[PDB]
């Protein structure tokens, strides 16, 4: 039995902390904490069921504990012991689940591996420095991620504009070919050869302008080809730093919490 020695029991932990401990856990995952009313006389069993965290109040009267009247159990442990081996479907349907998987403060402390308070503060100062450096690395890399993503969108838009421009200039060729075909014939018999040279000079002028616009798009396409590859590598370094940055912050917060709990209070 024993009281307050329960691995599944925790003191002033917040529901937000229980959520992080029950996030993505399987059905049956549970833990008990003091009620958020902070009255210190009531507790709250948090159970994982169907992807949700169910809050189950543990009412207390006289010396009896239970989920609802009548309250029969003598220790809050005895209430957890009972349902750790039996199902909660009897207390309420839509449960069909027992208190099978328990979040334990033993594996909670498994992070802080220091004994003397000086070692925890010395280690906390190490992880803090590492975390700030890793965060500044992530924030700068995220700025390149956003700028590269924005510039890629601009290039894709300008490439669309090049496509529409080249279409119009190519329409100008087909329009000139239609109108010239019978007018270069009218000048051939009338011996206006110099006028034909004028039409041919403007056509070369048109094809030369088109050839420039096609090359400007081709240079922007290979630019987009490089920058889309730079974005892909930035994206990978993001997904590599992200998970390590999370656990580095979690390790930091665990050492800071140890220091508060081992220090003087209230």
């Amino acid at each position: 039995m024993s009281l307050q020695d329960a691995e599944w029991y925790w003191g002033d932990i917040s529901r937000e902390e229980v959520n992080e401990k029950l996030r993505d856990t399987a059905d049956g995952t549970f833990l008990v904490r003091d009620a958020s009313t902070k009255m210190h006389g009531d507790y709250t069993l948090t159970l994982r069921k169907g992807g949700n965290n169910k809050l189950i109040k543990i009412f207390h009267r006289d010396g009896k504990y239970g989920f609802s009247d009548p309250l029969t159990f003598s220790s809050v442990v005895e209430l957890i012991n009972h349902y750790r081996n039996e199902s909660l479907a009897q207390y309420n349907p839509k449960l069909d689940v027992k208190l099978l998987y328990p979040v334990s403060k033993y594996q909670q402390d498994q992070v802080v591996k220091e004994d003397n308070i000086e070692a925890v503060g010395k280690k906390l100062h190490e992880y803090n420095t590492q975390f700030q450096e890793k965060s500044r690395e992530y924030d700068r890399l995220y700025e390149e991620y956003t700028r590269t993503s924005q510039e890629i969108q601009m290039k894709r838009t300008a490439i669309e504009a090049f496509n529409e421009t080249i279409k119009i200039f190519e329409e100008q060729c087909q329009t000139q070919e239609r109108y010239s075909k019978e007018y270069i014939e009218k000048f051939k018999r009338e011996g206006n050869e110099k006028e034909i040279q004028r039409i041919m000079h403007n056509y070369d002028k048109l094809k030369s302008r088109i050839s420039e616009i096609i090359d400007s798009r081709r240079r922007l396409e290979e630019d987009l080809k490089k920058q889309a590859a730079e974005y892909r590598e930035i994206d990978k370094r993001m997904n590599s730093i992200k998970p390590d940055l999370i656990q580095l912050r979690k390790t930091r917060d665990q050492y800071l919490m140890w220091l508060t709990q081992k220090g003087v209070r209230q």
Binding site: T37, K38, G51, S180, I199, K205
Partner: protein
């Protein structure tokens, strides 16, 4: 696609004074023509056709008047330039070329679509290319709202159209608070009348009853014989004191210098608006879900690619989940783990939910995750790309067949493997990971059952008994905050007494959370209770519209509560959240968007900020199509204000382009070189035409007339903000404000500033209506684009560090407030400084605003203190340094306390400091009494994208500063202790 930059050409922010334009004649010839950058298209077309005679085939060219120009814009659009009075530098050309064509088709339809496309930031012709049936059905079926509002607008003479352009700015109630009334003599209004021929004004003072209708005011003006400075008009029979200008003049003192004019002077200046049914309006064996007797299963086929180096990550997998709002209807189901190089699964995922039990708003939330387990027993998962889809389309059809879904990047800060709050649908950027799914087929089209069949199952499932304390426990549950813990025993208790809950309609949100939405029996019964549920206050109905209440009838009830009880003052007050919750709606066509658009089309002051809130997020691809289609419907029916909005938009685009030049091309040049440049383009003709004579986007009742260039300057920040100044062109600018000033910044996100100033204004309204004259200064702040926004300038305001110069003494601030307020005004300046300190000391502590300093705190000449720059709120220091503490951002040092105590030594012991604490306790408890309103306002912003407001855990910070899990005496003890530990004693 929308415009990349805002320059006059692609890659060129400003054309040279002369530029060569390739002109493509209709006969095939190309003519290079030199044009002035500001030359109109009438001039260019005339010079081109005179020059065209020197080129072959000129006989084929028709008359010049028979042609117009076409070119490619920076939006990659093939725009026809029908308005030939436009300058070359204003066409937003991609390249400097122009094509000559004959104009074909509908000139009116094409000109209007050009103006709508320019206003919303993207050509409306892109909406035509969208094959999505819901998009086209939305563009067609939304014209119902457009047709009605224009009919009601012109229904009544020229008065109904005046109610649109100049709506009354009135409070939600004429009931005058006790402390504001005691400022009356059991009201003196000075009416100035422009009497021809000189049109000068004679001062006429009148002492009249406050509840006198505006007509009763002109009655006394005639017997004795519009707000001056802005375009606010008292055109409805609301009590005069109910108008927000009059109500403000009583509390602040000063005389409501109003103005009287003739109706024919304004009705005639009002143009007639007409909605023209567009060119897309005239264009193009089921089973019930409760008959399918099988479980839900979805087949994850394969994905194209993911971006992750294989050396750092082990495997990848597709994580899925069936969600109803923020909660899962069943346990999340993962696929098997595969190598990153072979994103193939071809695997059915079996979900623990009966298909008929699927609620109407059931959604599939999925993502591709990388799982890596190289360290310890714990393996790290990281979301790589996410995607959500509605298991029912907008026609109540259950999704069947195969589906391709392009996924979204994981938003910054999101650490969950799934993004249930994210928007639904595919990523339009097809250069992203694409996941292929397959939904099951059931021999026919599966539809959601009709509401007649819903009430059938509810009447079968349902087929006095209360206790005194049980009724008291129900009342206690309804009074809790929306994020308070609800136990499973309290859920069963609420669901057991659902019918008595009707007696207390405010318990409905807590009751909806007690419903098993994965069970159609309780869900169908809940439908019948909300159908006849009595309506709640609008502030409580807004909660039923955030991310936790996705059901249509739940949201339909909330919209119907706003339709009958949400005043135009409150709708304009909470419009920010009301626009944001549109992102949560499953479909484009919903009752909420119709209510907002209908309200935006019948009230222009509402329609103004309705436009800019949507326009400010068109860059965001997650909502750009929803907000673009909604803005298209608005711009078609808003009437003449589309012209005024385009004046505002083009004015902003020039400021954006100018600031872009200073931050990139001219960043390494000195302040003097940037200013001579700054004035130069300001003296250009196009700049003045666009930057003058337009309504202020911060307040459309403010006319920004002529610029005062000598008072405009570049501020000393890295983003180079622009401190601008316009003259007030009103006939009596001296009565309200002369020389209007606005700060334009392009570079920093102003949504947190915009949100905080909204909350500050909302807090002040709570205090004033409950007898607390705590005067905040919630100046105007509007986000107009991606990290682009406007800022109202408070006149005659100075920072604390400016005061501490003209080093300084602890009494410097107190002596300045006495030198600027010598004699009798001193006793009122101290009162103003004291009541403004209490308001900001309480507000900044509750919200956790970024730390204050001698540059974050400003004081007006009359003593009004206020804060600026609210770039951080809530627990912004949580992730940086994991300290679990509530900061006091505004610590009243010795400088401020000396002022409050009128220069009394030992300031923590005077009668003025005790009354200063009394207002803080009155303010703290007042906001704590309205804690549910503030929780819901922050809850409605959760999907916006603001960094410090991503999860409900972020909102839990105000639950600590307000101490909601304690008693009222316990919380006030907490507030005193926090004020004590911050000021090192004195608060007892």
């Amino acid at each position: 696609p929308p415009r990349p930059s805002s320059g006059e050409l692609w890659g060129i922010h400003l054309m040279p004074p002369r530029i060569l334009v390739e002109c493509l004649l209709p006969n095939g010839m190309i003519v290079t023509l030199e044009c002035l950058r500001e030359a109109t298209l009438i001039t260019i077309k005339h010079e081109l056709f005179k020059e065209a005679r020197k080129y072959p085939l000129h006989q084929l060219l028709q008359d010049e008047s028979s042609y117009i120009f076409v070119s490619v814009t920076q939006e990659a659009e093939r725009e026809e330039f029908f308005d030939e009075t436009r300058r070359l530098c204003d066409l937003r050309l991609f390249q400097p070329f122009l094509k000559v064509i004959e104009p074909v088709g509908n000139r009116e339809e094409k000109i209007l679509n050009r103006e709508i496309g320019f206003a919303i930031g993207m050509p409306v012709c892109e909406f035509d290319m969208v094959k999505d049936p819901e998009v086209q059905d939305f563009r067609r079926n939304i014209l119902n709202v457009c047709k009605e509002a224009v009919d009601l607008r012109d229904l009544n003479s020229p008065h109904s159209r005046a109610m649109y352009v100049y709506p009354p700015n009135v409070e939600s109630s004429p009931e005058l608070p006790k402390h504001i009334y005691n400022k009356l003599d059991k009201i003196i209004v000075v009416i100035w009348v422009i009497v021809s021929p000189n049109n000068d004004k004679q001062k006429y003072t009148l002492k009249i009853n406050h509840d006198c209708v505006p007509e009763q005011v002109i009655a006394e003006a005639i017997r004795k014989k519009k707000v001056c400075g802005c375009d606010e008009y008292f055109l409805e029979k609301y009590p005069l004191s109910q108008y927000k200008y009059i109500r403000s003049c009583i509390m602040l003192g000063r005389m409501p210098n109003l103005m009287l004019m003739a109706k024919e002077s304004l009705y005639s200046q009002l143009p007639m608006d007409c909605f023209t049914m567009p060119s897309y309006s005239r264009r193009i064996s089921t089973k019930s879900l409760w008959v399918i007797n099988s479980a839900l299963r979805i087949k994850i086929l394969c994905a194209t690619y993911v971006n992750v180096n294989i050396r750092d990550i082990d495997k990848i997998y597709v994580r899925t989940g069936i969600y109803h709002g923020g909660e899962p209807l069943c346990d999340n189901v993962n696929t098997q783990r595969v190598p990153c190089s072979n994103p193939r699964w071809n695997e059915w995922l079996n979900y623990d939910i009966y298909i008929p039990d699927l609620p109407r708003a059931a959604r599939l939330c999925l993502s591709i995750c990388s799982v890596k387990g190289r360290k310890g027993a714990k393996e790290e998962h990281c979301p790589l790309a996410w995607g959500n889809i509605n298991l029912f389309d907008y026609t109540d059809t259950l999704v069947s067949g195969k589906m391709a879904l392009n996924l979204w990047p994981v938003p910054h800060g999101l650490e969950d493997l799934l993004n249930p709050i994210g928007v639904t649908g595919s990523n339009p950027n097809k250069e992203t990971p694409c996941l292929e799914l397959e939904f099951d087929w059931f021999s026919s089209v599966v539809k959601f059952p009709d509401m007649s069949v819903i009430e059938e199952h509810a009447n079968w499932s349902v087929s006095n008994e209360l206790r005194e304390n049980d009724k008291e426990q129900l009342k206690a549950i309804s009074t809790r905050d929306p994020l308070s813990e609800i136990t499973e025993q309290e859920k069963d208790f609420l669901w057991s007494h659902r019918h008595y809950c009707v007696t207390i309609p405010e318990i409905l949100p807590k009751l909806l959370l007690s419903v098993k939405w994965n069970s159609r029996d309780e869900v169908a019964q809940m439908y019948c209770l909300v159908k006849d549920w009595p309506p709640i206050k609008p502030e409580q109905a807004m909660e039923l519209l955030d991310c936790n209440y996705p059901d249509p009838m739940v949201r339909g009830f909330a919209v119907r509560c706003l339709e009958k009880y949400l005043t135009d003052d409150k709708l304009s007050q909470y419009l920010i959240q009301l626009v944001q919750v549109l992102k949560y709606e499953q479909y484009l066509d919903n009752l909420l968007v119709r209510f907002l658009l209908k309200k935006a089309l019948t009230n222009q002051r509402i329609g103004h900020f309705f436009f800019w809130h949507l326009k400010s997020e068109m860059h965001n691809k997650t909502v750009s199509q929803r907000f673009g289609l909604l803005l298209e419907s608005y711009c078609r029916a808003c009437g003449m204000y589309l012209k005024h909005l385009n004046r505002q938009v083009e004015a902003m685009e020039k400021l954006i382009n100018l600031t872009d030049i200073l931050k990139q091309e001219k960043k390494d040049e000195t302040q003097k070189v940037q200013m001579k440049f700054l004035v130069e383009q300001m003296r250009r003709p196009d700049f003045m035409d666009a930057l003058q004579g337009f309504l202020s986007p911060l307040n459309p009742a403010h006319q920004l007339g002529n610029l005062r260039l000598e008072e405009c300057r570049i501020m000393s920040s890295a983003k180079r903000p622009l401190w601008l100044n316009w003259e007030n062109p009103d006939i009596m600018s001296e009565l309200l404000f002369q020389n209007n000033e606005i700060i334009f910044k392009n570079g920093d996100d102003l949504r947190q500033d915009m949100l905080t100033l909204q909350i500050i204004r909302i807090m002040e309204n709570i205090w004033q209506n409950q007898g607390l004259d705590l005067r905040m200064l919630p100046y105007g702040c509007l986000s107009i684009g991606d990290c682009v926004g406007l800022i109202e300038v408070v006149r005659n305001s100075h920072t604390i560090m400016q005061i501490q110069c003209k080093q300084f003494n602890s009494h410097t601030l107190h002596q300045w407030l006495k030198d600027k307020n010598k004699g009798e005004i001193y006793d009122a300046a101290i009162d103003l400084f004291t009541r403004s300190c209490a308001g900001y000391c309480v507000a900044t502590f509750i919200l956790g605003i970024g730390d204050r300093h001698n540059s974050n705190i400003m004081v007006k000449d009359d003593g009004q203190l206020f804060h600026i720059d609210f770039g951080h709120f809530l627990d912004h220091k949580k992730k940086k340094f994991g300290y679990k503490r509530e900061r006091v951002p505004f610590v009243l040092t010795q400088d401020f306390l000396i002022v409050i105590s009128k220069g009394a030594q030992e300031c923590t012991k005077t009668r003025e400091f005790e009354r200063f604490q009394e207002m803080c306790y009155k303010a703290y408890l007042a906001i704590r009494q309205h804690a549910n309103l503030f929780i819901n306002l922050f809850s409605m912003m959760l999907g916006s994208g603001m960094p410090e407001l991503q999860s409900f855990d972020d909102i839990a910070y105000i639950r600590k500063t307000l101490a909601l899990d304690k008693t009222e005496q316990e919380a006030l003890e907490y507030f005193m202790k926090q004020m004590n530990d911050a000021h090192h004693g004195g608060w007892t």
